Amino acid sequence: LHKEPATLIKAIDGDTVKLMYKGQPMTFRLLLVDTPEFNEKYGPEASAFTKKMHENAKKIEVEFDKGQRTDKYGRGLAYIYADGKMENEALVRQGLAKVAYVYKGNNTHEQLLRKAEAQAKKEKLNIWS
Ligand SMILES: Cc1cn([C@H]2C[C@H](OP(=O)(O)O)[C@@H](COP(=O)(O)O)O2)c(=O)[nH]c1=O
Numbered sequence: 001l002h003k004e005p006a007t008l009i010k011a012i013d014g015d016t017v018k019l020m021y022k023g024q025p026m027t028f029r030l031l032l033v034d035t036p037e038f039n040e041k042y043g044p045e046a047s048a049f050t051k052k053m054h055e056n057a058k059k060i061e062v063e064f065d066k067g068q069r070t071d072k073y074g075r076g077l078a079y080i081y082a083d084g085k086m087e088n089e090a091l092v093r094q095g096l097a098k099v100a101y102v103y104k105g106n107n108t109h110e111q112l113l114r115k116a117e118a119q120a121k122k123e124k125l126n127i128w129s
């Protein structure tokens, strides 16, 4: 895989963000995770967590996997990096997302994220408390 530039347009929620990619506004859905909806328990915290990652970043990057790059809603499907830290993985590691939506062919970082989840669960963080 490889990283590509993007710039923040606006935070949305724990697992979606609006970025400018190749000069075009797009909504991105973070691969391999599920955050709670804003109206659900840990939703606000997940949204805040992701929001802070984007807004503090000097450099946002997107990384597509090997498969589908957009979903049926036209959302980009990527791993998102904030100053080199993967937001997807950070969310799971902190117990603010579950590993989810693991589809054949876009699953390059699956094991990395599962390892983070196992650690969040051990620590009983947030969703695992
Ligand atoms: C994360 C992800 C979601 N989706 C679709 C499946 C789900 O369809 P349904 O909307 O039919 O449930 C939806 C879940 O996203 P949200 O968790 O953002 O709602 O997005 C993909 O198709 N590919 C993916 O990689």
Ligand SMILES: [Ca+2]
Pocket: 015, 034, 035, 036, 037
């Ligand atoms: Ca969600």
